[PDB]
Amino acid sequence: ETLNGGITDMLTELANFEKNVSQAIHKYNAYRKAASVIAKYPHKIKSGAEAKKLPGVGTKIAEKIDEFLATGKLRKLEKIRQDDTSSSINFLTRVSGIGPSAARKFVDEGIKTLEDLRKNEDKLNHHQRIGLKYFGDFEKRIPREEMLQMQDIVLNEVKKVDSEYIATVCGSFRRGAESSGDMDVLLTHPSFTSESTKQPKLLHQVVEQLQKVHFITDTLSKGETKFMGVCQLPSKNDEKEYPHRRIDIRLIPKDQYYCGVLYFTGSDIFNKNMRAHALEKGFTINEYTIRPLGVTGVAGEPLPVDSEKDIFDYIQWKYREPKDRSE
DNA sequence: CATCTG
């Protein structure tokens, strides 16, 4: 956690690069396990040879560790931090809708900058056009003071559309947290379930509303259960318009809400432990259910959840307010 | 994992 941090980060930068630039998925994987395993390792790695002892770690890495340990740097790390090409890729990728692949094409196409991009909007898809348009906003964090004002509007509108809707805002928003990265809304209705053969309107109906009033301003994507888009806090008394923010809506068959809601809530850490305990309590949990565990190794059957309460009960645990769902 | 592209 700090005894072998430099080494671990390195491997990360390294991993990163194999993946992002080179298409070295394998190598890229290679770095990751390594960092993962040095991660656990309890002592002060005092050498490569030492490290090699580790599973996951070979000669090439071990070699790298040496140079690192030996001198506060690594030539490869050095070169990769300079190379304006590889910098391009990390950069472009900062745009929504641009990943590595795209990033690489564009570069070899000669686009490595923001302006580069605008000059050739023509070359981007709807998402990326969008992404370029909001780069700034996209990067800005979401403050709860705003977060609240937004959830206010959402809930009120889903409500009008139909009193039977059930919306919930997950994320760290839900955990407590002062700011957040994007609005994530969970969505359901009684009239939609595991078996219930669909209902698309269920989703497009609300979406409609939001936009109706100008809260939803642009579309990243819109399926029949998921919608990725752009909302915006109606600017008040003209002088201070707000940042544009990523928001997502997702339909769920009622019978599987709470686990969803549980799960999207977090923390990643929380889930695990909670999940680990579920298992101890002879249970299994995932994004959708809670099944009694058979001793044969495994076994099925989704247990019924009417709330987040139902789940805890099951695993016979302390009901956790979202705040303390941290770790 | 769902949606988009082409």
Next chain:
DNA sequence: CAGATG
């Protein structure tokens, strides 16, 4: 349809 992005 494969392949990419989130």
